[PDB]
């Protein structure tokens, strides 16, 4: 019974909190990372009592260089960590013209820079060990510029490409890289939205099946294949020596 | 008659330097932004002699908060600037496991954070004026995780999405947002498969003058882009958010 320890960012609520509970019941030791230390301690204390696994709590604001460097160091040196859940992330509030220099910095930093750096911290050790799993939490919005969340969607397009690139680089080294792409998730005079428990349960079914790109709210799985095929179809017609004749006078 | 001033980042060499020469010959005043002030001043001096336009040179490291804030201020306050060429960018050196925390920060900052912030600096004024043009320099690598430049390609996937999002948001305000996606561009025992930077920018400016939204000069079959975008929306058309698909149900 040698289950690897799982480090999970954004563990204080929502998708991260559900991942923590899931892996703890499966028998995995945990390292919980979030900005809200109080909700983490409450959740971690309950999971210790129920599942009897060991859980380390790391308070970290991954928009800060000190906090991000501390989590990187934990990922590099803790040889027991064999699973990274790149879950920490934030949304965009308002239109593009309502955004701030501070808001743009934080949104890219948390959704793009931090998960890339955490993946880099583990990839060197994972490759030497010949095993390891990296789960990046993307978003369906990464496919939908029409939704008006331009910067958030752009960071999620980054996350999907990162996952695809890491699989091709690290897959042959024995490393499993999964992209989980939720839609609207629950993390009144209105009914809608998917329960976070259903989302993580679907994501873990793909995880156990070693699925590379997992989109639970996608009804027709073939649509993803056709998108990837269309992507490669475009690349197959790239001729780099000269511009196409439609750009010639 | 009254051609707007163009601010061009990464103007010291390559695509940025070529955009500068092109817009100066058309009659546009320029604001050149780069870290290499010596090479920029050489270029700007030559363009002043040839085209007789005015050129302001701003030495700036767009990975730095102070320098980026100065260029933001210039874009917000200089009402003569009507064109933004988001060209500043750097490549990735080595595999993912060879990357550094320092290298990752700079790669994301220069290729993603800086162009987004510069676009935001102009968009507020552009929207009030009801006109303006934003040209984001992406890359074909944004379509190709197979090329092994994972972080660089990811930033270019970011830039393309940013361009698509800005067109739908700022287009209705009268703002033109173009995505220019080069492949290998030249900025003896092998066959040439790199495009001359002059040919790349000339193709990009033909798309610019035609108000093309996504311009991929090395793409031989233009329909491939349409089919990709259609497939993208086709995937979105099958998104059902209430429950997970039955393939994830026991």
**Tokens describing residue B167:** 């067109």
B142 touches chain A (CB under 8 A): yes
Q: Residues B127, B133, B137, CA angle at the centre, nearest 5°? A: 130
Among residues A19, A152, A176, A247, the one annotated as catalytic is: A152
Residues of the domain holding A131: 1-249
SS3 sequence, chain B?
CCCCEEEEECCCCHHHHHHHHHHHHHCCCEEEEECCHHHHHHHHHHHHHHHCCCEEEEECCCCCHHHHHHHHHHHHHCCCEEEEEECCCCCCCCCHHHCCHHHHHHHHHHHHHHHHHHHHHHHHHHHHHCCEEEEEECCHHHHCHHHCCHHHHHHHHHHHHHHHHHHHHHHHHCEEEEEECCCCEECCCCCCCCEEHHHHHHHHHHHHHCCCCEECCCECCCHHHHHHHHHHHHHHHCECCCCCCHHHCC
Residues paired with A57 in a beta bridge: A32
Q: Nearest chain B residue to A122 by CA: give it.
A: B97
**Chain B contacts of A216, Cβ < 8 Å?**
244-245, 248
CB B182 within 8 A of CB B19: no
Q: How many CB pairs under 8 A join A and B?
A: 259
B66 alpha carbon, distance to own chain's centre: 21
- Does residue A56 contact residue A77 with C-beta atoms inside 8 Å? no
* A157, A189 contact by CB (below 8 A): no
- Interface probe with B: pick from A70, A75, A165, A180, most Cβ of B within 10 Å: A165
Task: Name which of B161, B219, B235 is nearest A234 (Cβ-Cβ).
Answer: B219
Torsion of CA A189, A193, A196, A199, to 10 degrees: 170
Report whether A37 contacts A113 (CB < 8 A): no
Q: Which B positions 3-62 lie with beta carbon below 8 A of chain A? A: none
Quote the CA–CA distance of A116 and B101 in Å, as a whole number.
Answer: 9
CB contact under 8 A, A150 and B157: no
Contact state of A96 with B166 under an 8 Å Cβ cutoff? yes
A150 touches chain B (CB under 8 A): yes
List helix spans (H) across chain A. 14-26, 37-51, 65-77, 101-108, 114-129, 150-170, 196-208, 222-236
Q: Which of A108, A206, A217 sits opposite B241 (nearest CB)?
A: A217
Q: Which residues in chain B touch residue A221, judged by CB atoms under 8 angstroms apart?
A: 245, 247
Q: Is B176 annotated as catalytic?
A: no
Residues A133/A83, Cβ–Cβ less than 8 Å? yes
Angstrom distances, CA of residue A169 to CA of A33, A130, A157, A173, B10: 26, 13, 18, 8, 30
Closest chain B residue to the Cα of A123, Cα to Cα:
B97
**What distance in Å separates the CA atoms of residue A71 and residue A33, rounded to the nearest whole number?**
8
B66, B107, B154: which to substitute to probe chain A, counting the most A Cβ within 10 Å?
B154
Dihedral angle of Cα B96, B102, B107, B108, to the nearest 10 degrees: 100
Question: Technique behind this structure?
Answer: X-ray
Residue of A nearest to B227 (CA): A230
**Beta carbons of A122 and A76 less than 8 angstroms apart:** yes
Do the chains contact at B245 and A183, CB–CB below 8 Å? no
Cα B106 to Cα A177, A229, B90, B130, distances in angstroms: 24, 32, 9, 34
The span from the first CA to the last CA of chain A, in angstroms, equals 69
Q: Check CB contact of A208 with chain B, cutoff 8 Å.
A: no
Which B residues 218-247 touch A at CB under 8 Å? 218-222, 224-225, 227-228, 230-245, 247
Cβ–Cβ under 8 Å, residues A31 and A79: no
Instruction: Provide the domain count of chain A.
Output: 1
Under an 8 A CB cutoff, do B165 and A154 touch?
A: yes
Residue contact A192–B242, C-beta within 8 A: yes
- Indicate yes or no: CB of A243 within 8 angstroms of CB of B160: no
Picking from A3, A19, A21, A1, the residue whose alpha carbon sits closest to that of residue A207 is A19
Give chain B positions within 8 Å (CB) of A243: 195, 199-200, 202-203, 217-218
| CA–CA dist A176, A156 (Å, integer) | 19
**A202 has a chain B CB within 8 A of its CB:** yes
């Amino acid at each position: 019974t040698n289950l690897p320890t799982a480090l999970i960012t954004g563990a204080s609520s929502g998708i991260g909190a559900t991942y923590a509970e899931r892996f703890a019941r499966r028998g995995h030791n945990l390292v919980m990372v979030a900005r809200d230390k109080v909700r983490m301690d409450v959740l971690a204390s309950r999971l210790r009592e129920e599942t009897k696994v060991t859980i380390d709590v790391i308070q970290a604001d991954l928009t800060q260089q000190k906090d991000l460097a501390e989590v990187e160091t934990r990922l590099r040196e803790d040889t027991s960590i064999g699973i990274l859940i790149n879950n920490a992330g934030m949304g965009q509030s308002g239109a593009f013209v309502q955004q701030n220099a501070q808001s743009i910095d934080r949104l890219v930093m948390l959704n793009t820079t931090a998960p890339t750096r955490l993946a880099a911290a583990v990839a060197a050790r994972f490759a030497q060990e010949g095993k390891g799993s990296i789960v990046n939490i993307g978003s369906v919005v990464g496919f939908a510029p029409e939704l008006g969340m331009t910067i958030y969607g752009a960071t999620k397009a980054f996350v999907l490409f990162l996952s695809q690139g890491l699989n091709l680089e690290l897959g042959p080294k024995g490393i499993y890289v999964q992209a989980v792409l939720p839609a609207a998730t629950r993390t009144n005079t209105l009914p809608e939205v998917m329960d976070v428990n259903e989302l993580v349960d679907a994501a873990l079914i793909g995880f156990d099946r070693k699925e590379l790109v997992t989109i639970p709210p996608l009804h027709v799985a073939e649509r993803w294949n056709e998108l990837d095929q269309a992507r490669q179809g475009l690349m197959s017609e790239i001729r780099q020596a000269h511009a196409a004749e439609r750009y010639l006078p």
